[PDB]
Amino acid sequence: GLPNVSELVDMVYEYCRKRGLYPDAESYPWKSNAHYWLVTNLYQNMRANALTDAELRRKAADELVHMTARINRGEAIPEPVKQLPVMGGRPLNRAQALAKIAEIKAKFGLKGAS
Amino acid sequence: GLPNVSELVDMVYEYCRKRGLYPDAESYPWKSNAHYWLVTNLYQNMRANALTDAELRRKAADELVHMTARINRGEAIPEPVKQLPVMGGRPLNRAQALAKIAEIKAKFGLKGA
Amino acid sequence: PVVALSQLNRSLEQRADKRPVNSDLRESGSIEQDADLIMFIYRDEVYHENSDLKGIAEIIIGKQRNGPIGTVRLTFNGQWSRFDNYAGPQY
């Protein structure tokens, strides 16, 4: 079930404290997508508006009411957007790099590096 | 039926995000005329007053109440406002344009052109 | 053509909508007066983590002297540090 106002505020504070070790908000181990959306929206709003504790609680209550209304009316929550893979696959060594350097210098010669 | 305050705010934000490519507001795929009027009015009010989220919701609720009062008393909503046709139909090739330019030059005798 | 980069005041970050406008060139009215073309770069993902436009940037023509004005969408590949033509649906 959806957390109450106090629980939502506590979760937002915990996410704010713990976000330092996550490369992105999607990497956070959210209990559900709705919790992710609500907590991130509250964090962004309070960071961009310098809200107080009472204002933060009021915004959390409004977001909870909106989420409950949307759930009662249906709708579907997608899986964010994501941003780029991690890539990899670099089986390169120093000798091959030096060979590339020598080939480039031989092809050009005008490097002028000493 | 008319959307609630939250749905109206969501539609207004979506229109604000996605109107950067449409030629005009009337070209937006509005569900109904009332939705177009309400969303556009809220967007313009936010643009001209820098309304916050709570202020936007309050304005949306006020507009919904006003629209409901207007509907209950009757009145017919006209189809947007419209602005000019699309024109078109220009099947002109480079050769004909160059011939016309040369004819203009010959007729007016432009020394510098 | 001369393309000169400029900066905007901090107050822009306090507005409800952070897309730049001409009045955001505060302390630099002569720049708005003299410039023939003014383009603002806006990336929604910078301000919003949950943006649906990740990798998408907007070039907003705030002042076009000899033509229309509006927004042009491009794809931002920060991995390669590049801008590319936007291949998504256009409205």
HEC profile of B8-62: HHHHHHHHHHHCCCCCCHHHCCCCCHHHHHHHHHHHHHHHHHCCCHHHHHHHHHH
Is C65 annotated in a binding site? The answer is yes
| Interface contact flag, B52 C16, Cβ < 8 Å | yes
Q: Which of C13, C47, C55 sits opposite A83 (nearest CB)?
A: C55
CB A28 within 8 A of CB A43: no
Of A45, A49, A69, which has the smallest distance from its Cβ to B6's Cβ? A69
Contact A80 C50 (CB under 8 A): yes
Q: Which residue of B has its CA nearest to C86?
A: B21
Residue in C13, C48, C54 closest to A83 by CB: C54
Mutation choice for A interface testing from B8, B53, B55, B57 by most A CBs within 10 A: B53
Please tell me the distance from the alpha carbon of residue C36 to that of residue C3, in angstroms, as a whole number: 11
Q: What angle do CA C55, C56, C58 make, to 5 degrees?
A: 145
Neighbouring chains of A at 3+ CB pairs within 8 Å?
A: B, C
C-alpha distances in Å from residue C66, one per residue of B21, C1, C36, C38, C59? 20, 15, 8, 12, 17
CB-CB contact of B60 with B8 (8 Å): yes
- Rounded Cα–Cα distance for residues C72 and C59 (Å): 5
> Which of A51, A84, A86, A87 to substitute to test the interface with C, most C CBs within 10 Å?
A84
**From the CA atom positions of chain A, what is the Rg in Å?**
25
Q: What's the reported resolution, in angstroms, to a tenth?
A: 3.8
Q: How were these coordinates obtained?
A: cryo-EM
Following CA atoms C40, C42, C46, C52 in sequence, which dihedral angle do they give, to the nearest 10 degrees? 180
Chain C contact present for B58, CB below 8 A: no
Inter-chain CB proximity A81 and C54 less than 8 Å:
yes
For A88, the token pair is: 């990899």
How is the beta sheet containing C82-85 ordered, strand by strand? C37-43, C56-64, C71-77, C82-85
- Is the CB of C40 inside 8 Å of chain B's CB atoms? no
Longest dimension (CA), chain C: 38
Query: B22 CA to chain A: closest CA distance, Å?
Result: 23
C-alpha–C-alpha distance, residues A65 and C72, integer Å: 36
Is the Cβ of A71 closer than 8 Å to some Cβ of chain B? no
Say whether residue A84 is in contact with chain C using an 8 A CB cutoff.
Answer: yes
Sole residue written with tokens 């400029």: C6
The Cα of A81 is separated from the nearest Cα of chain C by a number of Å equal to 6
Rounded to the nearest 5°, which phi and psi values hold at C84? -135, 165
Q: Which amino acid is at B97?
A: A
Distance from CA of A114 to the nearest CA of C (A): 30
